[PDB]
Coordinates of N, CA and C in Angstrom, one line a residue:
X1 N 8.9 14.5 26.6 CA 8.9 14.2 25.1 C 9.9 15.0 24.3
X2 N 10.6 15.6 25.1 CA 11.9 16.3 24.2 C 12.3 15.9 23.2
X3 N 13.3 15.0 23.9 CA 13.9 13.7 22.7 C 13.4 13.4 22.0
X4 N 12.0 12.7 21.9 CA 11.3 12.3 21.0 C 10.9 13.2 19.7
X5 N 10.4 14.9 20.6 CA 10.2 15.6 19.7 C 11.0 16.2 18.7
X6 N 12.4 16.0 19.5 CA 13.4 16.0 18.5 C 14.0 15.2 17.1
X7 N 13.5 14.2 17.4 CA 13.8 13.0 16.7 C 12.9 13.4 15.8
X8 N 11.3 13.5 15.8 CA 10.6 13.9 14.7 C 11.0 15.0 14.0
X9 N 11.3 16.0 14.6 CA 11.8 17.5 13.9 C 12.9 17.3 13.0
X10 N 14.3 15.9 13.5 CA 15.3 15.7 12.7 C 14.9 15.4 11.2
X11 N 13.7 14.4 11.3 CA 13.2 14.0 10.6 C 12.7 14.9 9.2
X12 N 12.1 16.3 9.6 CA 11.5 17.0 8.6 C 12.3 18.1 8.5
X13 N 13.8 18.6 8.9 CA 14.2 19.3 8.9 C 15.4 19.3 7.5
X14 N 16.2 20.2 7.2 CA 16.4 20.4 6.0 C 18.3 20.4 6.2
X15 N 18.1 20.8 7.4 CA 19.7 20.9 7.8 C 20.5 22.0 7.7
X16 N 19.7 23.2 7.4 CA 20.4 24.7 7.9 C 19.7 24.9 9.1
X17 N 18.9 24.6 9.6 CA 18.0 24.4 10.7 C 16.6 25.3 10.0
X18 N 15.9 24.9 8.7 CA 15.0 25.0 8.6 C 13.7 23.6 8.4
X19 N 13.1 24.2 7.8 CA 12.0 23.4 7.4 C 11.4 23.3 6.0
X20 N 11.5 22.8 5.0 CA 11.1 23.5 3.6 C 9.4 23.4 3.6
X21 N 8.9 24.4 3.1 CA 7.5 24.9 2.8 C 6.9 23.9 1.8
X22 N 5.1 24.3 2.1 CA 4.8 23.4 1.1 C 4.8 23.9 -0.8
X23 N 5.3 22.7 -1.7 CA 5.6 23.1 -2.9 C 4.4 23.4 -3.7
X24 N 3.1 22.8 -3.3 CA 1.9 22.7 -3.9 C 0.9 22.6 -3.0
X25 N -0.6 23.4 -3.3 CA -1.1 23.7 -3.0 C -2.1 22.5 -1.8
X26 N -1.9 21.2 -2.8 CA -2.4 20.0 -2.5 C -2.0 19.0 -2.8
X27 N -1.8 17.9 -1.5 CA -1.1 16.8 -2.4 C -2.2 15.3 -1.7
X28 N -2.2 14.1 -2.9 CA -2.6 13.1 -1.9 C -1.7 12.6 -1.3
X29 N -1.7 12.0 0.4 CA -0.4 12.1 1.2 C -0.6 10.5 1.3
X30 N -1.6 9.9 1.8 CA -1.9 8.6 1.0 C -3.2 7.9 0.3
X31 N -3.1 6.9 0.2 CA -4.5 6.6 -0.4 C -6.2 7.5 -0.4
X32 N -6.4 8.4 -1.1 CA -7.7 8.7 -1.1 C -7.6 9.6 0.3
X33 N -6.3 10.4 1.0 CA -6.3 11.2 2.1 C -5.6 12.5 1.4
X34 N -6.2 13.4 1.4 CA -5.4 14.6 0.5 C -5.8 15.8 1.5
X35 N -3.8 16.4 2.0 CA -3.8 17.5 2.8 C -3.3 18.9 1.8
X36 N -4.2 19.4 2.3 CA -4.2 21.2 1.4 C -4.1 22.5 2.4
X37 N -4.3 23.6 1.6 CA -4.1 24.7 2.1 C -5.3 25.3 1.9
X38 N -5.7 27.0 2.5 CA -6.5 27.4 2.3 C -7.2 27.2 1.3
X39 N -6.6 28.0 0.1 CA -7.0 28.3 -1.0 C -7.8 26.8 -2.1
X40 N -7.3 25.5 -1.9 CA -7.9 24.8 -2.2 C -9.2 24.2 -1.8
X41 N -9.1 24.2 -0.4 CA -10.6 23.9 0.6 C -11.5 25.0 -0.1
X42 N -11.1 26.6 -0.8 CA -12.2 27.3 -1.2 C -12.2 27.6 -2.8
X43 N -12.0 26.4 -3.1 CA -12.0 26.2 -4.9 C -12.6 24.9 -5.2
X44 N -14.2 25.4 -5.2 CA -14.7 23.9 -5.4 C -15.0 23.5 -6.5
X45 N -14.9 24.2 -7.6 CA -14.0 23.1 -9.0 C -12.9 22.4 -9.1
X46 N -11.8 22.5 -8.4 CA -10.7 21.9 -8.0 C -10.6 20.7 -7.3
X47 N -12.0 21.0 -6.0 CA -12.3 19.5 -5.3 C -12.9 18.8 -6.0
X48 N -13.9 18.9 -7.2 CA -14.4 18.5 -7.5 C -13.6 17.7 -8.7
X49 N -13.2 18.1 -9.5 CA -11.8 17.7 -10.3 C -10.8 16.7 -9.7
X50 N -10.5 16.4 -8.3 CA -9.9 16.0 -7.5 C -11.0 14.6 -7.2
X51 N -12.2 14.9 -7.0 CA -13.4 13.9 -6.2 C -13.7 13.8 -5.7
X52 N -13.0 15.3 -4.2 CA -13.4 15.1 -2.9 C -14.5 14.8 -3.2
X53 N -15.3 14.0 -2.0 CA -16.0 14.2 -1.2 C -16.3 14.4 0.0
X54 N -15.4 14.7 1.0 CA -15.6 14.8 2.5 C -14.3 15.6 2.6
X55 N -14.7 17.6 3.2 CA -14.0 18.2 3.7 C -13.8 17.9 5.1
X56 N -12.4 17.8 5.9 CA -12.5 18.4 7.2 C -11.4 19.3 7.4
X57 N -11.9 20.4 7.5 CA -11.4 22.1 8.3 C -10.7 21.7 9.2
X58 N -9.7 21.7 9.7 CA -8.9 21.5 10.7 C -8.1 23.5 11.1
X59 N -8.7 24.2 10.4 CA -8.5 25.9 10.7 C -9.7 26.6 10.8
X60 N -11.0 25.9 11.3 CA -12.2 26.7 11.0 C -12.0 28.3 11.8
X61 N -12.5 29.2 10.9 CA -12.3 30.5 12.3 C -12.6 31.5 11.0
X62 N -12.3 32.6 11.8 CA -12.3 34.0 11.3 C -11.2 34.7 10.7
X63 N -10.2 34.7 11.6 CA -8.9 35.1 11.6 C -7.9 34.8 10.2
X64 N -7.2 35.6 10.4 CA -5.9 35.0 9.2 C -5.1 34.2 9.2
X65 N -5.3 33.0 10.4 CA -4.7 32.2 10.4 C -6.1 30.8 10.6
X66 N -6.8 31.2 9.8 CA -7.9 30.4 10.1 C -8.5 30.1 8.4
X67 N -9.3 29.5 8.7 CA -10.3 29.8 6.8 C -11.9 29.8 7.2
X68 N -12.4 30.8 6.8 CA -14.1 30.9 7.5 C -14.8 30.2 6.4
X69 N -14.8 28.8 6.7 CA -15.8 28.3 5.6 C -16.7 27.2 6.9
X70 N -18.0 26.8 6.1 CA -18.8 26.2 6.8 C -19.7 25.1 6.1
X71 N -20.8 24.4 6.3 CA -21.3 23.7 6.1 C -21.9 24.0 4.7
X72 N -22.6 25.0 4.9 CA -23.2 26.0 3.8 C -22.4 26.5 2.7
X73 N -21.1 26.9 2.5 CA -20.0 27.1 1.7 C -20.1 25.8 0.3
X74 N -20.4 24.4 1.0 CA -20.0 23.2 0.7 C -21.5 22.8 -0.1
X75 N -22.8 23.4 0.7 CA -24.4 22.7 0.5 C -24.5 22.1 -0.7
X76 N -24.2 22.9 -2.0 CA -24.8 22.3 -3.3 C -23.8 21.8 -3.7
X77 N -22.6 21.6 -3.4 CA -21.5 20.7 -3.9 C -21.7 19.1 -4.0
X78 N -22.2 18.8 -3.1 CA -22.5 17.3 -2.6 C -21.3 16.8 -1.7
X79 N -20.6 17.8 -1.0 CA -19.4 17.4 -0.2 C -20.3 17.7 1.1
X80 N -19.3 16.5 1.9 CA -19.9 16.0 3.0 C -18.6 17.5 4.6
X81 N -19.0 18.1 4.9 CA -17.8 19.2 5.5 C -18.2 18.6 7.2
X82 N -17.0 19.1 8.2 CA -16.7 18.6 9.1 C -16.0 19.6 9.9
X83 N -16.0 20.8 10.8 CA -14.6 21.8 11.0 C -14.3 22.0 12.6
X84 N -13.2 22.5 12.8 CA -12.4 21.8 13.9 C -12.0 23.4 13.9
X85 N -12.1 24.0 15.1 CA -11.7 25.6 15.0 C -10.1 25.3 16.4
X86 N -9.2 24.5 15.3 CA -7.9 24.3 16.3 C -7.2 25.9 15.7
X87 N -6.4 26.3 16.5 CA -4.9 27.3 16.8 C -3.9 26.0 16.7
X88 N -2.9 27.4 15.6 CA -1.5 26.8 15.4 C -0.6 27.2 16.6
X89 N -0.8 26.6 17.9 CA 0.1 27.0 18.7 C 0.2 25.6 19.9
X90 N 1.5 26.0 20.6 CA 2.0 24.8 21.2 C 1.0 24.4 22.3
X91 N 0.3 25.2 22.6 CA -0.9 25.3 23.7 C -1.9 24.7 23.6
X92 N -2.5 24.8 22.2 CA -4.0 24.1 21.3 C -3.6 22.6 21.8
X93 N -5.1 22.1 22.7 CA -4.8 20.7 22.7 C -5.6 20.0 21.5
X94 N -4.9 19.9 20.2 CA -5.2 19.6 19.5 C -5.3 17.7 19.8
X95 N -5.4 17.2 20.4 CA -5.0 15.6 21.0 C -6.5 15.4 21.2
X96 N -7.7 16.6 21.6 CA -9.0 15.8 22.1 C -9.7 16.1 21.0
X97 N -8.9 16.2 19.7 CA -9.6 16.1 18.3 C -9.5 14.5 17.8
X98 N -8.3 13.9 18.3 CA -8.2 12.9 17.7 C -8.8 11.8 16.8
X99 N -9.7 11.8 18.1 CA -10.6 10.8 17.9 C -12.1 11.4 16.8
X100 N -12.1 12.0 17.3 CA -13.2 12.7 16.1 C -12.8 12.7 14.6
X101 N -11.6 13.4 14.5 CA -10.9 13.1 13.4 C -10.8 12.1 12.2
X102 N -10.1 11.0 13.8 CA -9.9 10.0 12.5 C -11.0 8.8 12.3
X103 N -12.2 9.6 13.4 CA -13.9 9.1 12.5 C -14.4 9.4 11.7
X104 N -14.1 10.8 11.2 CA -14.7 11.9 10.1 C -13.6 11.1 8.8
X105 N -12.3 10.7 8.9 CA -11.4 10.2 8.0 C -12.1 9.0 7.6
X106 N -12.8 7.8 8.9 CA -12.7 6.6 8.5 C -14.3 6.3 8.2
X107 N -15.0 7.9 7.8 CA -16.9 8.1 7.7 C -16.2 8.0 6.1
X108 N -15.1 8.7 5.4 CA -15.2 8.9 4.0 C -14.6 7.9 3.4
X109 N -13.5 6.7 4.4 CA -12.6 6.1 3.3 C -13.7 4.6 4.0
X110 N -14.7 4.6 4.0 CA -15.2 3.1 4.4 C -16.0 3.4 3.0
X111 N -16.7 3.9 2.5 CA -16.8 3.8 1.0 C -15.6 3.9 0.2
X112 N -15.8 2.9 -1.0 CA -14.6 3.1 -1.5 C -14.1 4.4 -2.8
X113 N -15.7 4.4 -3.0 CA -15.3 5.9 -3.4 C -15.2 7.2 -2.9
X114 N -15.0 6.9 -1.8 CA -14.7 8.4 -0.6 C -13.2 9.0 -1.1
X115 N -13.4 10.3 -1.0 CA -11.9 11.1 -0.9 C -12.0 12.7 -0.1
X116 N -10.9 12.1 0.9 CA -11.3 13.2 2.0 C -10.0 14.2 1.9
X117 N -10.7 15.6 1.8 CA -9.3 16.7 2.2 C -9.2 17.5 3.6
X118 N -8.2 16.7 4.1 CA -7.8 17.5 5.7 C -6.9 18.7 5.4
X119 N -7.5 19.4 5.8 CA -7.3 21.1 5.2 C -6.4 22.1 6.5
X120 N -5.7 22.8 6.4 CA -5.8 24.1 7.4 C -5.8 25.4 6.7
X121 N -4.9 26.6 7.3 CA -4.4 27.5 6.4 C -3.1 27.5 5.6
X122 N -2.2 26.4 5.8 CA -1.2 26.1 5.1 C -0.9 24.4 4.5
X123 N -1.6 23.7 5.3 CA -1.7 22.2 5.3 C 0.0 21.7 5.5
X124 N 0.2 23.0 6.9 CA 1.6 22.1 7.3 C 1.6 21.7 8.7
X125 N 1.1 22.5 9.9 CA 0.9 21.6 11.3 C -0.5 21.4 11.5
X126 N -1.7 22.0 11.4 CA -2.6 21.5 12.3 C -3.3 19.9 11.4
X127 N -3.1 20.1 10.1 CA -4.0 19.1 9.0 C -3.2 18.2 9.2
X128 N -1.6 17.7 9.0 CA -1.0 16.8 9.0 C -1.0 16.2 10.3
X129 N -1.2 16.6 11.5 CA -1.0 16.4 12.7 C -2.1 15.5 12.8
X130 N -3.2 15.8 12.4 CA -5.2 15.0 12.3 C -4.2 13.7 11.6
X131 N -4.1 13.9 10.5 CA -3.7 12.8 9.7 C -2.9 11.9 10.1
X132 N -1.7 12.4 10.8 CA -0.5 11.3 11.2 C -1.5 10.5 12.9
X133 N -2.0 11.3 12.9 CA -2.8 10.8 14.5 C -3.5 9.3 13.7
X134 N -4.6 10.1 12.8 CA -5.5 9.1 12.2 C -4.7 7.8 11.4
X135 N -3.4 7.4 11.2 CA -2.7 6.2 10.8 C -2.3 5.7 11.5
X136 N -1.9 6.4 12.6 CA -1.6 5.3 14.2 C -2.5 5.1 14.9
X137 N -3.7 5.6 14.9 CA -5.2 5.1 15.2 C -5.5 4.3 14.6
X138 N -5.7 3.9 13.5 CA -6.3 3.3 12.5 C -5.4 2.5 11.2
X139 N -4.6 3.0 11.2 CA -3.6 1.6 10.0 C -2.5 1.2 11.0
X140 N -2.5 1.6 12.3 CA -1.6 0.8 13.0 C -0.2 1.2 12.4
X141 N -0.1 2.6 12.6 CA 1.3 3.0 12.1 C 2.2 3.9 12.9
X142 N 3.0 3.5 13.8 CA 4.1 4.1 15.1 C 4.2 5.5 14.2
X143 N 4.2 6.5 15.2 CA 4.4 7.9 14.8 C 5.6 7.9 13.4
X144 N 6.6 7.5 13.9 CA 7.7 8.1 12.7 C 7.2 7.8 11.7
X145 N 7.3 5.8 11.7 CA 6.6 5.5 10.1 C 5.4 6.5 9.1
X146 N 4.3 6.7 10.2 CA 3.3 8.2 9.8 C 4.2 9.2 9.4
X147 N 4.1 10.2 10.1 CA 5.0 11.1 9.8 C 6.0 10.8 8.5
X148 N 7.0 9.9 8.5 CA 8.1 9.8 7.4 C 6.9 9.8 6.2
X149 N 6.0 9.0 5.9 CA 5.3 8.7 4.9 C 4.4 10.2 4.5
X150 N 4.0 10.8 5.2 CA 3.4 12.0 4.9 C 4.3 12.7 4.5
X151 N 5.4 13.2 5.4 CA 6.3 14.2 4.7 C 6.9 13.6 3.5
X152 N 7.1 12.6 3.1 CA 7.5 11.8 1.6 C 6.7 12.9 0.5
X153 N 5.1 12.8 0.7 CA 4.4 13.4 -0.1 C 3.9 14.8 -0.1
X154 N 4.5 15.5 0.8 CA 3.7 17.0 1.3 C 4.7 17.5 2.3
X155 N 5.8 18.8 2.3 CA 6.3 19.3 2.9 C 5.3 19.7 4.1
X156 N 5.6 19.3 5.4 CA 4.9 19.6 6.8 C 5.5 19.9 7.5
X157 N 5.5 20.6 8.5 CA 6.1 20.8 10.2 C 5.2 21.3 11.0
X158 N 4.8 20.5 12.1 CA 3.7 20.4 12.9 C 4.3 20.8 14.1
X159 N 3.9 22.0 14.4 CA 4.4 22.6 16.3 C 5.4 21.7 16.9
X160 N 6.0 22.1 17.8 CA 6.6 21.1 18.9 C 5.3 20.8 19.9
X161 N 4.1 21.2 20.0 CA 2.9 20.8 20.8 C 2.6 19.7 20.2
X162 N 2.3 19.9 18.9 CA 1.6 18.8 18.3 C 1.9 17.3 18.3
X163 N 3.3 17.5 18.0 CA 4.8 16.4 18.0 C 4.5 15.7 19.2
X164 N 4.7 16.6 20.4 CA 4.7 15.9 21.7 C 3.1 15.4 22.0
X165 N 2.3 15.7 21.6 CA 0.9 15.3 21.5 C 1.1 14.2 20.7
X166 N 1.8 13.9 19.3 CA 1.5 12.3 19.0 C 2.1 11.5 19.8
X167 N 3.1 12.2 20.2 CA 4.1 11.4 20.9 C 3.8 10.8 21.9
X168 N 3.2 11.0 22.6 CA 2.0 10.8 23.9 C 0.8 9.7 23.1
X169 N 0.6 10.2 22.2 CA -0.6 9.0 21.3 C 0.2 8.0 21.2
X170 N 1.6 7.9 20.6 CA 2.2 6.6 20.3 C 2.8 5.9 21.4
X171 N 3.2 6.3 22.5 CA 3.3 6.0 24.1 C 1.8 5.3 24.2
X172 N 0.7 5.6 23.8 CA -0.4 5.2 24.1 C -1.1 4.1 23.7
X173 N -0.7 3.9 22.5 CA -0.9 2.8 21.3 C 0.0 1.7 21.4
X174 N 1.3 1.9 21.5 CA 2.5 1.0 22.1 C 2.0 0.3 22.9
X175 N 2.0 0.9 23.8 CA 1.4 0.5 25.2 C 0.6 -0.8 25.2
X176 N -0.5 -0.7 24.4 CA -1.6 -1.2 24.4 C -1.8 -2.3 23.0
X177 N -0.4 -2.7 22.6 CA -0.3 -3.4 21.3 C -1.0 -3.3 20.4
X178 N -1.2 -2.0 20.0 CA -1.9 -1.3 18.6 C -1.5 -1.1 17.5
X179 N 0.0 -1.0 17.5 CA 0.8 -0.5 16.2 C 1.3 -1.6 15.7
X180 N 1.9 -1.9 14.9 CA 2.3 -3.0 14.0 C 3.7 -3.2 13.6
X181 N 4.7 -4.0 14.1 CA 6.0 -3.9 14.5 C 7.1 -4.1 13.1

């Protein structure tokens, strides 16, 4: 998946050979799907101002590259929490979340007043990664098209693991006339 993963990288790259950072804290990336950073997943007047209702953690942990929040953090809010203790690294097979994922995504947007925040510690590879999985799962949307439409709304760069992990998901969906031409 080299090539491939290159092709995505061309895609969110900036052209000095970086990647630009996220500008804001939180954005909605599409309809009623809003990816954030730490600091917002632990400001629950903000989600609430917003309307989450359904967190998923996509950084649960300890560490400083994690956010230690839990079920209990969320109890008297009336948010529905979900957490996924992935590593930002090319090794995390972040791929056997998928599917859980974009169930916990499609538990919040099957009511119409659901609004779900896919969170990590920065809301640039492990949250967007859930997300672009959960549109080519479910809106029938070929990796780039995802991808292109997320980074529209929210500066991301997701691993070269990750990349080659959708990449493999959209080989997979292709395959099997899922996506929408």
């Amino acid at each position: 998946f080299e090539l491939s993963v290159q092709d995505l990288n061309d895609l969110l790259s900036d052209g000095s050979g970086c990647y630009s950072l996220p500008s804001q804290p939180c954005n909605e990336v599409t309809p009623r799907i809003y990816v954030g950073n730490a600091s917002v997943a632990q400001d629950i007047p903000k989600l609430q101002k917003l309307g989450i209702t359904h967190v998923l953690n996509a950084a649960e942990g300890r560490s400083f590259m994690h956010v230690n929040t839990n079920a209990n953090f969320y109890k008297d809010s009336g948010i529905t929490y979900l957490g996924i203790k992935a590593n930002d690294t090319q090794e995390f097979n972040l791929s056997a979340y998928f599917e859980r994922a974009a169930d916990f995504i499609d538990q919040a947007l099957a009511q119409k007043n659901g609004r779900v925040l896919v969170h990590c510690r920065e809301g640039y590879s492990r949250s967007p990664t859930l997300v672009i999985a959960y549109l080519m799962m479910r809106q029938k949307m070929d990796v780039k098209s995802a991808l292109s439409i997320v980074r529209q709304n929210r500066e991301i760069g997701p691993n070269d693991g990750f990349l080659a992990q959708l990449c493999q998901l959209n080989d997979r969906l292709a395959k099997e006339g899922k996506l929408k031409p």
